[PDB]
Amino acid sequence: SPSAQELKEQGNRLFVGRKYPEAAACYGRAITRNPLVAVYYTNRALCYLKMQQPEQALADCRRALELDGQSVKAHFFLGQCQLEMESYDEAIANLQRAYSLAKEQRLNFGDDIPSALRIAKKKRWNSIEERRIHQESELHSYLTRLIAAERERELEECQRNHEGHEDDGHIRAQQACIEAKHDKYMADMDELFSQVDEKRKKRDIPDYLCGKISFELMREPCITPSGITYDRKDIEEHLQRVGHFNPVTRSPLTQEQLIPNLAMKEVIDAFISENGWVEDY
Amino acid sequence: DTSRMEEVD
Numbered sequence A: 001s002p003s004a005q006e007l008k009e010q011g012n013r014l015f016v017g018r019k020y021p022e023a024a025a026c027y028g029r030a031i032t033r034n035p036l037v038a039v040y041y042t043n044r045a046l047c048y049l050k051m052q053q054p055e056q057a058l059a060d061c062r063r064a065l066e067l068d069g070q071s072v073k074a075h076f077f078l079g080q081c082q083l084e085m086e087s088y089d090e091a092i093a094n095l096q097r098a099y100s101l102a103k104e105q106r107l108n109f110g111d112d113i114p115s116a117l118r119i120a121k122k123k124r125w126n127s128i129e130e131r132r133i134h135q136e137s138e139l140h141s142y143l144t145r146l147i148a149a150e151r152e153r154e155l156e157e158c159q160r161n162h163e164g165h166e167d168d169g170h171i172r173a174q175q176a177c178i179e180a181k182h183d184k185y186m187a188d189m190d191e192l193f194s195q196v197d198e199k200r201k202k203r204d205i206p207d208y209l210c211g212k213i214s215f216e217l218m219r220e221p222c223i224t225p226s227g228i229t230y231d232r233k234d235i236e237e238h239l240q241r242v243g244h245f246n247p248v249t250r251s252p253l254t255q256e257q258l259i260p261n262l263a264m265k266e267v268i269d270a271f272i273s274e275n276g277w278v279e280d281y
Numbered sequence B: 001d002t003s004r005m006e007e008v009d
Helices: A002-014 A018-032 A036-048 A054-064 A072-084 A087-104 A113-129 A139-156 A173-195 A260-274
Strands: A222-223 A230-231
Touching: A002 A139, A018 A036, A018 A072, A036 A072, A072 A087, A072 A113, A087 A113, A113 A260, A139 A173, A139 A222, A139 A260
Parallel strands: none
Antiparallel strands: A222 A230
């Protein structure tokens, strides 16, 4: 009896009311009523995501796009899902694409995309990073076991030394007691092989090295009278595609007022020149 | 006063 346009509104009220499983089911009746409407699917897709079930959302997006391959939201959400499924490559791609469309269609979300985009780039890198081998070392592999050895000679050759004088309760603490003595002795070591000119140290890219708009590494940093540093290429268009105001302080800014942050370029250059990765990031 | 994406319109 209720119209699809009414069922959507209903779900809209629920979703705002955080009743995600209920709103989603509400969009489902509006879809059976009229499949040919992209909004429904993308909306329901957002319910599934909030309901932590990319399985469904992924499918529902793969339908909203069949009725609108130019859907910014559909692409954004689709990419989102892929993140959960851990398809880091595709995910960042659809976000990338969902970003261009949004820019193209002259839509405005701000951060919402470059942010999640930058986030998906970070969560991706995190993967192949913990996937590296680092390759122990000649002296390492050696001393590494020398300790594990000295440990057995105690826990398994000095613990049962007094099965009576030290029952379960006693040496159960006398066990981890020495274990920590060795887990640390070695701990100090690890830091040695890491600070010893070794690249085995976690490789990540700072934040103060990215733009306040692009949310990515800057190649032509320049600051404003306010003091915020953006990439000359991003606040370039924002000045001729959104207005004449600082995208942060919202101050009356104008293109011929941008100062080149030379000291920054330096810092950014030096970074790259030292970090092999990146470009792969 | 823009508009976010994590919103069902």
